Amino acid sequence: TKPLSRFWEWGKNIVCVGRNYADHVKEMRSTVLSEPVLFLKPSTAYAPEGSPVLMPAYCRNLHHEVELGVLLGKRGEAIPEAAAMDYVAGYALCLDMTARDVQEECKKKGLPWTLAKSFTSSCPVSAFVPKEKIPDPHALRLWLKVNGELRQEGKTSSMIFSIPYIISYVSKIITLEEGDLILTGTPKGVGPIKENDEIEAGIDGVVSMRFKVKRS
Amino acid sequence: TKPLSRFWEWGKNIVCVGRNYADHVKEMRSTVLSEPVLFLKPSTAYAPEGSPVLMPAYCRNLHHEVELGVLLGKRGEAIPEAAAMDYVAGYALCLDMTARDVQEECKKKGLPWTLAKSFTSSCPVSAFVPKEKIPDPHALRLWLKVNGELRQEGKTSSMIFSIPYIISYVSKIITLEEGDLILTGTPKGVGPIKENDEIEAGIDGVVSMRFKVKRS
Ligand SMILES: O=C([O-])C(=O)[O-]
Ligand SMILES: O=C([O-])C(=O)[O-]
Ligand SMILES: [Cl-]
Ligand SMILES: [Cl-]
Ligand SMILES: [Cl-]
Ligand SMILES: [Cl-]
Ligand SMILES: [Cl-]
Ligand SMILES: [K+]
Ligand SMILES: [Mg+2]
Ligand SMILES: [Mg+2]
C-alpha cells in the first residue's frame, strides 16, 4: 500500500507556514500578520535521510530552516481547530532549505517564492515519527548543528499559531490529502550553508538526522 | 492505478508559468522577465469536469485564466529542450482560477501567491488529451465563454516561451514526476466571474469543457 514510514515516496503535497516564531520574524525584520504566510513545495522537494541537499545553480546564498513537520492521516477539508489532531498521522523533522538572495528579490519585485523555497531537495526530512511518540508537540526542542556547531534552537511552545489552528487554517484554503505534510516554521538563527557542509538536526528525545550539501 | 485519462486523481504536482502571452502582460502592466514566472498549485486544486469551481470565503474578486496544460509521461530531471516532447504524455485544457484582489496585495507586500493562486479547485481541468491528438501545440486556439459570451481567445503561437523550453527550464529547477502537469499561461481578456456563472472553454477541434461557479 502507501506506508506512513515512507510517506515522502507517495505524499502529493507540502505546505509551509511563514512567521510562526517571533524571534525569527525579528531576525528578518518582516512583520507578523493576523494570519500565517503559506507557500508550497513540490513532492520532489523531499530529500529523505541518505539523499544529500543540492544547491541549485542559481543559488548564491543557501540557508537552513529547521521546522517541525505535521503529516496527515485522512482527507481534510475545513477541519475544525478542535478536531485537527484527529486528522494527524504523525510528524517528521524537516529543513525548509531556502535561496535567501532569490527570496529577497522575489519579495522586492512581488513574485512567487518558488525558486527561493520550492526547488528539488528543498525539503530534507527525518524518519516518520508516529503520533503516540509525541504526547505534546508544543513541548519540543528543535536544534540544528553545522559541522558540529549549533546555529538554531527553539521550543515549539514559541509557536505564534498552534498546530491545530494551522491544520484548520490551511484545510480551509487547501484540502489536505492522506500523506500531505505541513512545515510549521523555523525559530531564530537561520543562516548560510556552503558546499560540503555537514548538517545535523533533531527533536530532543525523539529523532535526529544528518544531511550533506552538494551542487548541480 | 495510474490511468492518464484520470491523471488528476493521482498526479502529485502542478506548475504554472506567468507572463507567457504579451497581450496578457500588457493587460496587467506587469513587465516580462528573461525567464518565466513559476508558482505551484496543490494536487487538491484539480476540479475535474463534473466538479464546480468554488469561490473561497476570502475571495472578493475571482478571475478566469484559460491555459494549455502539458501532462508528463516519465520522471524528468534536467530534461534537454531538444528532448522535452519525448517526456510529454498529453495535454489538458485548464483554468488558472485566481483571487486577483489577494494577488494584488501578495505582490505589494512581497508575499507568496498561494492564497491568490493555490486554493482548492483553483485548477479546473478538461478530459485528458493524448499527444497523438495534438500534432502541434503552438498552432492551437484557446477560447473561454461566460454565460454564452466570449471573454478570452488567443493562439498558442503567441507563447513568449515555447513548451519544450518550459519542460526543460522547469525540470532544471523542480524534478517532474509521471502525472505532473504544467500550465503554460493565459492570453488577453482575463476578468471577473461571480456566483452561479456558467463557464465554457475549449481548444478548437480538440476539446471543450463546462464548469459552474459555487461558494463555500
Ligand atoms: O518564512 C519562513 O519560511 C519561516 O518563517 O519559516
Ligand atoms: O500571470 C499569470 O498567471 C499568467 O500569465 O498566466
Ligand atoms: Cl540564493
Ligand atoms: Cl509562491
Ligand atoms: Cl558533523
Ligand atoms: Cl480576491
Ligand atoms: Cl497558434
Ligand atoms: K504538489
Ligand atoms: Mg520557513
Ligand atoms: Mg496564469
Author numbering:
A (entry chain A), B (entry chain B): 10 to 225
Give the published text.
FAH domain containing protein 1 (FAHD1) is a mammalian mitochondrial protein, displaying bifunctionality as acylpyruvate hydrolase (ApH) and oxaloacetate decarboxylase (ODx) activity. The superfamily of fumarylacetoacetate hydrolase (FAH) proteins describes enzymes that share a conserved catalytic center, yet exhibit multifunctionality in prokaryotes and eukaryotes. FAHD1 was identified as oxaloacetate decarboxylase (ODx), and as such acts as a regulatory enzyme in the TCA cycle; accordingly, as it was associated with the regulation of mitochondrial function. We report the crystal structure of mouse FAHD1 and structural mapping of the active site of mouse FAHD1.
The chemical environment of the ligand-bound mFAHD1 cavity is similar to the hFAHD1 environment. The catalytic center, defined in the human protein by amino acid residues G24, R25, H30, E33, K47, E71, E73, D102, Q109, and K123, is also found in the mouse crystal structure with residues G27, R28, H33, E36, K50, E74, E76, D105, Q112, and K126. The N-terminal ‘lid’-structure in hFAHD1 in between G24 and E33 is also present in mFAHD1. Correspondingly, human and mouse protein show similar Michaelis–Menten kinetics, and mFAHD1 displays the same bifunctionality as ODx and ApH. We find that FAHD1 displays bifunctionality as ODx and ApH in both human and mouse with comparable kinetic profiles. This is understood by comparing the core structures, differing in only 24 amino acid residues and displaying the same secondary structure and an identical catalytic center. The catalytic mechanism and metabolic function are suggested to be identical in both organisms.
